[PDB]
Amino acid sequence: APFVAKDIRVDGVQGDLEQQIRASLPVRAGQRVTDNDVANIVRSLFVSGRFDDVKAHQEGDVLVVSVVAKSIISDVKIKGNSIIPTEALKQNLDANGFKVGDVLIREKLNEFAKSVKEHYASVGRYNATVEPIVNTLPNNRAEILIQINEDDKAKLASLTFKGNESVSSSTLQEQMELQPDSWWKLWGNKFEGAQFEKDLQSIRDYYLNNGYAKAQITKTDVQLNDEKTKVNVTIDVNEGLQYDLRSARIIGNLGGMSAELEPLLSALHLNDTFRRSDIADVENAIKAKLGERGYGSATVNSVPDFDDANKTLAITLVVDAGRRLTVRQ
């Protein structure tokens, strides 16, 4: 849709190149320009090889040209490398166009990372990870960082606890199967060794097996290492107040049985420190009991109610019994 380009902005870039883009622009501040002219700019730009993307529209009186330029490589560095010597990894980069000269092509980077993974596997580190990182820098440049873990893991260095008001470090780490100097599989990336999932329970269980029935575990850090041995771990825990059990009131669909279920709240110790494990064993018999009469899908669910103020807690075992059975011969 033709128009007069009073100004001509060029958006993607800085200096160096912003300059040469301008200097080659087939068009002139001031003239009026067709779709066709503008296409000519955009195609000329793409043919250089230098851009992942070029667009061009009118923004009032100015022809704007946005752009996204291939970075060029300032430093290449590798951490975690350890039995493929850096010499050879550096040689590989340099054969695959990741010399410092060069214009980074990002996809070839991931291809390169895959290929190094495949070499680590000809030497039997089938768990290796080779993840490349690109930090971008001004002047249309960037540096490359190849991160390598040749196994996952290495030995666990330190656990550290934050927000543990009342319970000590030393206590919680007896709750945990994972002790220092035992290994710490890190399943690449980002999903805590499976078994550490376990131990976060042990803990939750134990604040709940000892009053603190708000204890949410807040967050968890993992500190790797530069070389990818040793890791430091940090568990952030919010204990909250340490409640007590006053009432133990039941509801819902009990399939008659209210009868013989009410005698079950009884090896409970009302007006004493709350406890999940006790509260559970109730649900267990409640559920065994309902099972006798053929209700063996019955579901208990411990809702609560709080005196934060007066330090106590009101149990509401919502039950219901998934049908009765009746087999008949």
Report helix, strand or coil for 222.
Answer: strand
Nearest to 256 by CA among 297, 282, 294, 283: 294
CA angle 40, 41, 45 (to 5 degrees): 115
Taking the CA atoms of 140, 61, 42 and 20 in sequence, report the sign of the dihedral they define.
negative
Cα 29 from Cα 287, distance rounded (Å): 83
Q: Is 6 left (phi over 0), alpha (psi -120 to 50) or beta?
A: alpha
Provide the 10 A C-beta neighbour count for residue 256.
12
Q: Is 194 left (phi over 0), alpha (psi -120 to 50) or beta?
A: left
**Angstrom distances, CA of residue 147 to CA of 12, 16, 71, 224:** 29, 31, 20, 11
φ and ψ of 270, to 5 deg: -55, 155
Taking the CA atoms of 286, 288, 291 and 293 in sequence, report the sign of the dihedral they define.
negative
**Angstrom distances, CA of residue 122 to CA of 96, 115, 228:** 20, 11, 20
How many DSSP H helices and E strands does the chain contain? 8, 15
CA atoms within 13 A on the CB side of 250: 20
42 contacts 33 by C-beta, under 8 angstroms? no
303 contacts 238 by C-beta, under 8 angstroms? no
User: Residue 262: what residue type?
Assistant: E
CA atoms within 13 A on the CB side of 196: 20
105 contacts 70 by C-beta, under 8 angstroms? yes
Retrieve residue 13's tokens.
């870039």
* Domains in the chain, CATH or no CATH each: 3-69 (3.10.20.310), 72-149 (3.10.20.310), 156-238 (3.10.20.310), 244-320 (3.10.20.310)
| DSSP secondary structure string for all residues of 9-57 | -B-S--THHHHHHHHH-SS-TTSEE-HHHHHHHHHHHHHTT-EEEEEEE
Taking the CA atoms of 217, 309, 166 and 174 in sequence, report the sign of the dihedral they define.
negative
Cα 173 from Cα 289, distance rounded (Å): 38
Resolution (A): 3.0
Helices marked H in the chain:
16-24, 35-47, 86-95, 106-122, 169-172, 195-208, 258-261, 276-292
Output the 3-class SS for 174-198. Answer: CCCCCCCCCCCCCCCCCCCCCHHHH
Cα 313 from Cα 162, distance rounded (Å): 26
Looking at residue 119, the DSSP 8-state letter turns out to be: H
Report helix, strand or coil for 155.
Answer: coil
User: Residue 11: what residue type?
Assistant: D
Q: Is 327 left (phi over 0), alpha (psi -120 to 50) or beta?
A: beta
In angstroms and rounded to an integer, the radius of gyration of the C-alpha atoms of the chain is 33
Taking the CA atoms of 4, 9, 15 and 16 in sequence, report the sign of the dihedral they define.
negative
Cα 310 from Cα 298, distance rounded (Å): 33
Diameter of the chain by CA atoms? 98
